[PDB]
Design a protein around this motif. Structure first.
Motif, PDB file in Angstrom:
ATOM      1  N   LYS A  14       0.714  -1.094   0.031  1.00 29.68           N
ATOM      2  CA  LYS A  14       0.029  -0.058  -0.053  1.00 29.68           C
ATOM      3  C   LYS A  14       0.890   1.232  -0.030  1.00 29.68           C
ATOM      4  N   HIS A  15       2.281   1.133   0.017  1.00 34.13           N
ATOM      5  CA  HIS A  15       3.037   2.186   0.238  1.00 34.13           C
ATOM      6  C   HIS A  15       3.568   2.428  -1.233  1.00 34.13           C
ATOM      7  N   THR A  16       3.646   3.831  -1.570  1.00 35.53           N
ATOM      8  CA  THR A  16       4.428   4.676  -2.688  1.00 35.53           C
ATOM      9  C   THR A  16       5.707   5.409  -2.094  1.00 35.53           C
ATOM     10  N   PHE A 141      -0.259  -5.862  12.002  1.00 36.83           N
ATOM     11  CA  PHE A 141       0.317  -4.890  11.162  1.00 36.83           C
ATOM     12  C   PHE A 141       0.361  -5.500   9.758  1.00 36.83           C
ATOM     13  N   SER A 142      -1.101  -5.682   9.307  1.00 37.62           N
ATOM     14  CA  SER A 142      -1.380  -6.244   8.034  1.00 37.62           C
ATOM     15  C   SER A 142      -0.652  -5.183   6.718  1.00 37.62           C
ATOM     16  N   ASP A 143      -0.755  -3.920   6.974  1.00 31.39           N
ATOM     17  CA  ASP A 143      -0.473  -2.784   5.912  1.00 31.39           C
ATOM     18  C   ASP A 143       0.966  -2.684   5.829  1.00 31.39           C
ATOM     19  N   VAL A 144       1.895  -3.265   6.834  1.00 31.39           N
ATOM     20  CA  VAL A 144       3.117  -3.126   6.706  1.00 31.39           C
ATOM     21  C   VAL A 144       3.796  -4.190   5.464  1.00 31.39           C
ATOM     22  N   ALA A 145       4.397  -3.681   4.527  1.00 32.23           N
ATOM     23  CA  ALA A 145       5.023  -4.472   3.489  1.00 32.23           C
ATOM     24  C   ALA A 145       6.264  -5.439   3.880  1.00 32.23           C
ATOM     25  N   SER A 164       2.212 -18.846   0.988  1.00 37.34           N
ATOM     26  CA  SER A 164       0.671 -19.080   0.416  1.00 37.34           C
ATOM     27  C   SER A 164      -0.060 -20.249   1.158  1.00 37.34           C
ATOM     28  N   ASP A 165       0.694 -21.365   1.455  1.00 37.48           N
ATOM     29  CA  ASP A 165       0.311 -22.454   2.071  1.00 37.48           C
ATOM     30  C   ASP A 165       0.024 -21.946   3.564  1.00 37.48           C
ATOM     31  N   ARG A 166       1.006 -21.456   4.235  1.00 40.47           N
ATOM     32  CA  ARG A 166       0.595 -21.099   5.656  1.00 40.47           C
ATOM     33  C   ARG A 166      -0.087 -19.737   5.862  1.00 40.47           C
ATOM     34  N   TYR A 167      -0.016 -18.723   5.137  1.00 39.63           N
ATOM     35  CA  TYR A 167      -0.603 -17.661   5.473  1.00 39.63           C
ATOM     36  C   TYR A 167      -1.635 -16.982   4.360  1.00 39.63           C
ATOM     37  N   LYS A 168      -1.757 -17.735   3.343  1.00 38.09           N
ATOM     38  CA  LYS A 168      -2.690 -17.217   2.248  1.00 38.09           C
ATOM     39  C   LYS A 168      -2.078 -15.752   1.905  1.00 38.09           C
ATOM     40  N   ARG A 169      -0.830 -15.361   1.901  1.00 41.43           N
ATOM     41  CA  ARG A 169      -0.442 -14.091   1.762  1.00 41.43           C
ATOM     42  C   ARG A 169       1.273 -14.503   0.845  1.00 41.43           C
ATOM     43  N   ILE A 170       1.492 -13.664   0.045  1.00 44.92           N
ATOM     44  CA  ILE A 170       2.738 -13.825  -0.558  1.00 44.92           C
ATOM     45  C   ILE A 170       3.554 -12.519  -0.298  1.00 44.92           C
ATOM     46  N   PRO A 171       4.918 -12.273  -0.583  1.00 41.99           N
ATOM     47  CA  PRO A 171       5.491 -11.554  -0.393  1.00 41.99           C
ATOM     48  C   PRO A 171       5.076 -10.186  -1.303  1.00 41.99           C
ATOM     49  N   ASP A 172       5.434  -8.849  -0.753  1.00 37.54           N
ATOM     50  CA  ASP A 172       4.925  -7.637  -1.168  1.00 37.54           C
ATOM     51  C   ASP A 172       6.016  -7.075  -2.204  1.00 37.54           C
ATOM     52  N   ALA A 173       7.416  -7.844  -2.284  1.00 34.06           N
ATOM     53  CA  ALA A 173       8.360  -7.471  -3.200  1.00 34.06           C
ATOM     54  C   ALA A 173       9.443  -8.488  -2.943  1.00 34.06           C
ATOM     55  N   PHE A 174      10.380  -8.571  -3.625  1.00 33.59           N
ATOM     56  CA  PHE A 174      11.654  -9.168  -3.377  1.00 33.59           C
ATOM     57  C   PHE A 174      12.864  -8.416  -3.770  1.00 33.59           C
ATOM     58  N   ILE A 175      14.010  -8.422  -3.014  1.00 33.93           N
ATOM     59  CA  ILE A 175      15.210  -7.923  -3.056  1.00 33.93           C
ATOM     60  C   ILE A 175      16.092  -9.016  -3.811  1.00 33.93           C
ATOM     61  N   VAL A 176      16.575  -8.817  -4.999  1.00 33.00           N
ATOM     62  CA  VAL A 176      17.583  -9.651  -5.376  1.00 33.00           C
ATOM     63  C   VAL A 176      18.849  -9.262  -5.453  1.00 33.00           C
ATOM     64  N   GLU A 177      19.569 -10.033  -4.645  1.00 37.55           N
ATOM     65  CA  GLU A 177      21.148  -9.596  -4.341  1.00 37.55           C
ATOM     66  C   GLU A 177      21.906 -11.006  -4.758  1.00 37.55           C
ATOM     67  N   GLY A 178      22.903 -10.807  -5.543  1.00 40.82           N
ATOM     68  CA  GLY A 178      23.764 -11.859  -5.875  1.00 40.82           C
ATOM     69  C   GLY A 178      24.812 -12.161  -4.688  1.00 40.82           C
ATOM     70  N   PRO A 179      24.981 -13.607  -4.515  1.00 43.38           N
ATOM     71  CA  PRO A 179      25.974 -13.858  -3.318  1.00 43.38           C
ATOM     72  C   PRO A 179      27.378 -13.595  -3.702  1.00 43.38           C
TER      73      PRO A 179
END
Ligand SMILES: Cc1cc2nc3c(=O)[nH]c(=O)nc-3n(C[C@H](O)[C@H](O)[C@H](O)COP(=O)(O)O)c2cc1C
Ligand SMILES: COC(=O)c1cccc(NS(=O)(=O)c2cccnc2Nc2ccc(Cl)cc2Cl)c1
Ligand code: SF4
Ligand SMILES: [Mg+2]
Length: 350
Positions: A14-16, A141-145, A164-179
Motif C-alpha cells: 500500500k506504500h508509494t 500490522f497487515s499493511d506493513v509490506a 501461501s500455504d501457511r498465511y494465504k499471503r505472498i511477499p509484497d516485493a523481493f530484493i535480488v542480491e547476488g551472493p
C-alpha cells in the motif's frame, strides 16, 4: 541545472515512494535516523537497520551493559532505541515511507520484526536466510509490506509457496542480491520471469549498482527498482561518521571477502579488527550480546577471529583500531563525500 526525473514512483504493498530506489539497510548504526530520514525526505526509501540498536547514542537506551556491550539479544536489539531512531527519522521525513532491515539469522528475529512494526516501519526487509515465517510476527500490522532478500529464482518459488500455504499471503516485493550465473544482469531476469507465476511481484535489484546507467540497465531487464548501499555510505548523513573520513582514500586492494560468525561471507575493509587479527592483537571473544543464532554463542566467532556484534558496534562508536568496517565492492569509487540530496539528484535527474 537538474532535469525533472523521468523515473516513476514505485508502489510496494500500500506504500508509494517517489523514486524506485531503496537505500540499503546497513548495520551496525550506519543507516539510522539521519541517513534513513534524509533518504526518505528526498523521496527514496530510507531503510533503518534494526540490528545492534542497543549501541545507539553510546548505549543510552539499554537496560544492561556487560563489558561495554549490550547484554544479550534483548539489549543488543533494543526496542526503546529502535523507537527513538524511528521517531528521530520522522522528524526529518514526516510520513514518507521507511523500511526496517532485519537479518533473519539474528536471535529473537520475531520480536525485532514486531518491534519494527510498532516503531512505525512501513516495510520490513529481511535477508541472511530463507524467511518463511515473516508474516507470523506481523498479524497486527497487515499493511506493513514484507520483502525478502533472495539470491535465486528457486528461493522466490519456495517462499511464495510456503507463505501461501501457511498465511494465504505472498511477499509484497523481493530484493535480488547476488551472493557467472550470479551476475545481476543474469539473475534479475530469471527472478522476474519466475515471479510471473505468482502475479508480478515487484523485483528490486541490488549489488554493484553505482549510477543512473546501472539503474536504467536494471529497469530495462524487468526490475521495478534498485537497492543501493555503498553510494549512501559515502554521504555526509551516514550515521557512522567514520566512513566519511575513511572512504575517500580506500583502495581497491584494501577490500576483501572474509568469513563471518553468521555463516555468510562479508566484504570488509582491511582495517580495524581485520588488521588486528593479522597482527595477533585482536580482542578476546566473549559472547555478550548473543547477536546471531548461527554463531552458537561464540563458536564461529572464535573460528573466524572476531565477534561481529562487538566489531560493528565499535565502528559506530568511532573505534578505528578495533571496529569492523564493511563496504560493497565499489567502495573504492567513493572519491568525495556528498550530501544525500546531491546523491539523489545525481541518481534521478533526467
Ligand atoms: C556497510 C554495509 C552494511 C550492510 N549491512 C547490511 C545489513 O545490516 N542488512 C542487510 O540486509 N544488508 C546489509 N548490507 C548490504 C546492503 O544492504 C546492500 O544490499 C548491498 O551492499 C548493496 O550493494 P552496493 O553496496 O553495491 O550497493 C550492508 C552493506 C554495507 C556496505
Ligand atoms: C554487495 O554486498 C556486499 O558487498 C556486502 C558487504 C558487507 C556485508 C553484506 N551483507 S550483511 O547483511 O551486512 C552480512 C553478511 C555476512 C555477515 N554478516 C552480515 N551482516 C551483519 C551480521 C550481524 C550483525 Cl550484528 C550485523 C550485520 Cl550488518 C554485503
Ligand atoms: S560471539 Fe557470536 S553470537 Fe555472540 S555477539 Fe559475537 S558474533 Fe554475536
Ligand atoms: Mg577512490
Amino acid at each position: 541545472g537538474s532535469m525533472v526525473s523521468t523515473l516513476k514512483p514505485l508502489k510496494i504493498g500500500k506504500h508509494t515512494i517517489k523514486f524506485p530506489i531503496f537505500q540499503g539497510g546497513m548495520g551496525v548504526g550506519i543507516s539510522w535516523d539521519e541517513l534513513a530520514g534524509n533518504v526518505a525526505k528526498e523521496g527514496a526509501l530510507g531503510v533503518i537497520s534494526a540490528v545492534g540498536t542497543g549501541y545507539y547514542k553510546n548505549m543510552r537506551f539499554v537496560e544492561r551493559i556487560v563489558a561495554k556491550k549490550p547484554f544479550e539479544a534483548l539489549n543488543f536489539y533494543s526496542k526503546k532505541a529502535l523507537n527513538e531512531i524511528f521517531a528521530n527519522a520522522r522528524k526529518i521525513c514526516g510520513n514518507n515511507p521507511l523500511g526496517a532491515n532485519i537479518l533473519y539469522a539474528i536471535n529473537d528475529y520475531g520480536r525485532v520484526l514486531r518491534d519494527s512494526c510498532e516503531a512505525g516501519a512501513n516495510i520490513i526487509i529481511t535477508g541472511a536466510g530463507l524467511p518463511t515465517n515473516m508474516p507470523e510476527f506481523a498479524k497486527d500490522f497487515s499493511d506493513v509490506a514484507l520483502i525478502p532478500i533472495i539470491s535465486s529464482a528457486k528461493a522466490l518459488k519456495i517462499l511464495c509457496k510456503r507463505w501461501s500455504d501457511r498465511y494465504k499471503r505472498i511477499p509484497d516485493a523481493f530484493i535480488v542480491e547476488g551472493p557467472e550465473e550470479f551476475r545481476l544482469e543474469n539473475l534479475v531476469p530469471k527472478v522476474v520471469e519466475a515471479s510471473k507465476e505468482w502475479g508480478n511481484i515487484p523485483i528490486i535489484a541490488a549489488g554493484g549498482i553505482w549510477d543512473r546507467k546501472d539503474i536504467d540497465t536494471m529497469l530495462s531487464l524487468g526490475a521495478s527498482g534498485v537497492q543501493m548501499a555503498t553510494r549512501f555510505l559515502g554521504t555526509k548523513e551516514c550515521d557512522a561518521k567514520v566512513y566519511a573520513d575513511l572512504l575517500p582514500t580506500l583502495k581497491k586492494e584494501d577490500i576483501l571477502l572474509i568469513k563471518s560468525p553468521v555463516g555468510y561471507p562479508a566484504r570488509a575493509i582491511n582495517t580495524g579488527v581485520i588488521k588486528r587479527i593479522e597482527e595477533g592483537n585482536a580482542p578476546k571473544i566473549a559472547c555478550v550480546s548473543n547477536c546471531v543464532a548461527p554463531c552458537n554463542r561464540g563458536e564461529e566467532a572464535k573460528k573466524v577471529g572476531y565477534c561481529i556484534a562487538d566489531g560493528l558496534g565499535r565502528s559506530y562508536l568511532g573505534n578505528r583500531e578495533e571496529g569492523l568496517y564493511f563496504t560493497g565492492a565499489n567502495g573504492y569509487r567513493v572519491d568525495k563525500i556528498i550530501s544525500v540530496h546531491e546523491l539523489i539528484k545525481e541518481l534521478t535527474e533526467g
